[PDB]
RNA sequence: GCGUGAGCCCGGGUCGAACGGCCUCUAGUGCAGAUCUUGGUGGUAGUAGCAAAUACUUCAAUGAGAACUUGAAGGACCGAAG
């Protein structure tokens, strides 16, 4: 069980979308600030896309952490995972994904043994 | 799953030989536009159309397949500045 938090609060489950790309495939939907000097969005119109801004800003005690209340942190290998022996509250390993199936099984018994949460364990 | 975000990480599939994190160093380093360059591919669309030069028909052979192959017969044209 992770340490005692204060109860994770996201503002937003959004992606933010960059403008027109659902309509021209050549856009990638990673977003793009608009600086066009009659863009709708850039100028803030009702009813349009958001921009990103600072004050969607995540809370400063719960950031990184997942659902569980674990930070998420890549392991490669036993010696990596056993960088979280003091941080089985905090921290949960996640197995790098060109990471052989042996070695997964051995940082996952050894993660059991340091009662590490491991976030890709099953396989 | 994480990050406000650019992005980062993981699961599954495909695949087959290299690759990544951290601190510095370096640059031919980030694309939707430029009637941009090269290449590829659409709707249009089975659409416009394939209509000058009079014209083809019967039987048989060949052949998987015959209006535009061939034989015979008929009907036609060029009509000696052909
Ligand atoms: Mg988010
Ligand atoms: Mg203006
Ligand atoms: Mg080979
Ligand atoms: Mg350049
Ligand atoms: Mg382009
Ligand atoms: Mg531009
Ligand atoms: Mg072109
Ligand atoms: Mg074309
Ligand atoms: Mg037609
Ligand atoms: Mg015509
Ligand atoms: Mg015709
Ligand atoms: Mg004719
Ligand atoms: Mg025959
Ligand atoms: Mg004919
Ligand atoms: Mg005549
Ligand atoms: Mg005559
Ligand atoms: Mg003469």
Redesign the pocket.
Known sequence: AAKKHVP?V????????????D??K???????????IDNRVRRRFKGNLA?????????KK??????SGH??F?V?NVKDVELLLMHNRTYAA??????SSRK?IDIITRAKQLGVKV??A??
């Open positions: 994770i996201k503002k937003r489950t959004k992606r933010f979308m960059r403008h027109q790309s309509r021209f050549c856009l990638d939907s990673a977003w793009r600030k608009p600086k066009g921009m990103p801004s600072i004050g969607y800003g995540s809370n719960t950031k990184h952490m997942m659902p930070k998420a890549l490669h996640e197995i790098a994904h060109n990471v997964r976030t890709n099953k396989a």
